Design a protein around this nucleic acid. Sequence first.
DNA 1: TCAGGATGTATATATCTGACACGTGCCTGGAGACTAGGGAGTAATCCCCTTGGCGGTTAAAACGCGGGGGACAGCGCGTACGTGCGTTTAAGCGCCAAGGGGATTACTCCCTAGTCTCCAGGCACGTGTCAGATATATACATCCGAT
DNA 2: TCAGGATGTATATATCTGACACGTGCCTGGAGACTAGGGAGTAATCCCCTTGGCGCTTAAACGCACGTACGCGCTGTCCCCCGCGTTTTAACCGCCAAGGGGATTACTCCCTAGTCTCCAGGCACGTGTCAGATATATACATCCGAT
Lengths: 107, 107, 93, 93, 95, 98, 88, 87, 12
Amino acid sequence: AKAKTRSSRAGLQFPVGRVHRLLRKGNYAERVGAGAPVYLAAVLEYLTAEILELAGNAARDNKKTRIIPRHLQLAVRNDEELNKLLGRVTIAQGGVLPNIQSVLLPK
Amino acid sequence: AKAKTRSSRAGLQFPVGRVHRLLRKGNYAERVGAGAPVYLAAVLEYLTAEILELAGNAARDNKKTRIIPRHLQLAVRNDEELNKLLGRVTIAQGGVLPNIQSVLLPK
Amino acid sequence: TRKESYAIYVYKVLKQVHPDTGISSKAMSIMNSFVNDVFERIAGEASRLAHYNKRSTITSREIQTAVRLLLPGELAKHAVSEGTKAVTKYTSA
Amino acid sequence: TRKESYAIYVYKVLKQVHPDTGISSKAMSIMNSFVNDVFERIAGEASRLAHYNKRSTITSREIQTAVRLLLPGELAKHAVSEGTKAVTKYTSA
Amino acid sequence: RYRPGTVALREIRRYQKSTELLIRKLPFQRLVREIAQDFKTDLRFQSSAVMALQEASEAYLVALFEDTNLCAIHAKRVTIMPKDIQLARRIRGER
Amino acid sequence: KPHRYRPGTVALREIRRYQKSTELLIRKLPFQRLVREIAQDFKTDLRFQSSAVMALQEASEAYLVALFEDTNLCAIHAKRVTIMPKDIQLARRIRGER
Amino acid sequence: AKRHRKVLRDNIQGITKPAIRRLARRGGVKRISGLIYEETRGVLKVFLENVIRDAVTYTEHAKRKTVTAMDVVYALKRQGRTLYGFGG
Amino acid sequence: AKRHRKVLRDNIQGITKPAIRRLARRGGVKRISGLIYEETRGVLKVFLENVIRDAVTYTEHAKRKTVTAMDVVYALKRQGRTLYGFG
Amino acid sequence: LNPTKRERKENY
DNA sequence: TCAGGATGTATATATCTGACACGTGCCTGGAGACTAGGGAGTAATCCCCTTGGCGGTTAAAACGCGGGGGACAGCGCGTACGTGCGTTTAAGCGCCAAGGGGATTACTCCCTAGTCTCCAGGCACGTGTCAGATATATACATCCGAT
DNA sequence: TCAGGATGTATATATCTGACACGTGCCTGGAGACTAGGGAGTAATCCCCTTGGCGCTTAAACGCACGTACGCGCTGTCCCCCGCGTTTTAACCGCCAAGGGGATTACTCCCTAGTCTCCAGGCACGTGTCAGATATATACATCCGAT
């Protein structure tokens, strides 16, 4: 017959066959279900889309049309949610979000 | 022929068949060697002996002939290496190591 | 010399949220590493959950609970909603 | 019923080291939990170590390497020495 | 009667020797049930579960109070204050 | 008399110009020399790549910046404005590294 | 006029002032301010919220309605505060 | 007389006062003391020792002689401080 | 090198 | 300082209840073939990394100086903690009632996975380019140290 | 308080390059049979948890009152650290040599694991004891605060 990719069937963008292979080859368990790759692909797709949206907003705010690690760092640290998710992670070439203790400022 | 256990012919006391069973049916790798259970049993036996000897020392230091979680806590926290290995664990019913800051004492 | 990667897929995702912006290569590597990290975290938690309950299989229930138990609150809500709708669409179609 | 314990082996090691003492039930449970925790740490590190090298076999080499990675300082040295002693005695016998 | 601080050092000696529980049992157990009410209705709790929760809470609070005391001593004081405890938590990646 | 800023303003300008860029603040050759000197730690003569040293320097600088932030907070906590070795020690001990 | 339950006390205040002081002494402090009590109550409430949330997630995954000690141990280890003694 | 080295001040001295001061400024401090420049070298040397120890252990197990960026990344992740980017 | 019997603790 | 109190601190006794030793069986680890595929050893190719040395540009780094302001020491002082005593109040401990929740323990099947067998079509790699991000200069408007 | 400087901040502009688009080969994801075992449903059986209560003992928790000592504000007085000018030197490219190390991409093949079949020794569970550790009292010794 004619092939219908699982990514097309589920309506996602991320691969589902590749995720299935990774589950079956990383020996996480003896047998993987048939909806687990789809669920995992959807979750990864959602997280990627959300962080990319924040990064693009930051890039526009910086008058640039290309995401960079600094923009990723700003997107992650500026919201209290991806900051907690990516707590221990150090994004290379990220820098720090700027703040100065109010005590240090002059009169 | 007569059967002798791998624990005995290895010289150890900790079980080797049980360790092999766990390694196999633990989803750690597809296929398991034949010296890894022996090595793991030896290491577990060494660590157990070390901590037990320290605990027994503490127990006799308090004039008692049965190791209790308090003595386990005391031995673990007084030995620095075991303290680093078990830095993040909390032995239940272990109490705390006695310590009063020098500044707080009276003049 | 074939090295699997997520660059094509994250680029397809990017080109529908912000249909005009681009992305540099170093940022692309960072995103690929991020996706690998999240995948590994979720898969490992699901494996441990399956081990705890004597189940020998991983399925959508373990994936969903691993998501709900790793992602913080409000983010996990949307993550599980989207995962569920994708799975239902896959099963129906 | 029929839950595996390690308790008898811990008591055997105790009666080897200090042949006049004993262990309360809470201490025995704590020690069993410690053995299980360190076992799962070593096994997980060995599993990841084998997966990193495109290797599909747990063996004594990466058991030793996981021991060296997790145990700090003198513990690693003594444990490695004892493990090698035991494995060579086993193969010889 | 006694000069100030004498009873304090005495109580520190008392409570660093013991291994018992410090928060009352039933008040903590009631707090646990009440705070677990919101996540999901009609949850049961067994005594071992509640006891493990209390052990964890006591250990956490004791370590926190050590950190707070060290912060207070660092600032040339002996009394602890919410400033000290806030600094201690926020420097540990919690706040 | 020539123009001379009061003590503090140049420091504030440096703060707000270094909290905005992303480069590396430790020089690559000195850091690499230090790394290879330490690398007689549990082996002998070794070969390092370039990405290895770059990653190591990234992690090192991130760690040091975080430590300095915690130290600054500790120094402010004592109603002081100069960081001190006691601040370093307190901050590094509360985190659990000492 | 007391058919309703007008009489009731808050649960977080069940963590008494002398209990806070006992914890403080075992920590090794010598003088306690007046606001340590409220701040400690807040901190304890937050910690319990997190741990119990994860434990309940485990239990409801397992299709049960009782939070077991082993489930609490799982949640606590996940938070990163492994606890020895209650099995596992 | 001079075939002996008599050279190479310690490599930890290569982490200079202004580099330490730049790190401090990015941290956000205004006024610095004079012994910070020694305490920070101590802590840096300790951190590097730990990370390099783990990386070299991974390299030795892999039976190579080259420390790889992936080995460094694995060492950092084991220590508990993940690094996105390299690898 | 047959490592044996390390810095055993002293009192308690 | 010394005697007056208050507080751990050893010590003998009785209680007990928790650790330890002992028999059963059943289940799992061991002996013993049989086999196939993972891994060790080999050969070929190419790119990266070493060690010792050289030459050059040019920003940072080292040094010195002067001057301010931030630190640390004292001096009150007036709270806000402590310590102690009396008294409620709640923790803990028992007991009553009936259920549901749950964890084995033991069969049954359905169905949903893994396995193999082709076979096209996703995707990774190797090719262009041109649009975005640079570095440049300049005018400006915008805080900072003295009236 | 107002005029006098030094410093980002915008502006516009020529340049570099590294994202983005396109075409091919290869491998792997999908379609399609076949099957077997994991898990879902059922249904006994025993033990724990719940939600209402009730009555009792006995320490802790609370409240109240002196009453110190210490946290805080002010003042003083150094001295140490920052800002700035001046050298100089070490990083940073660019180079050169040869060879080794590490990744691929095939071939080969031994040997060491999993997979079975039996089969007995582990070891866990259910009992029945004793002794190590309390709890009281009880006398002893041993700081601490006020005359």
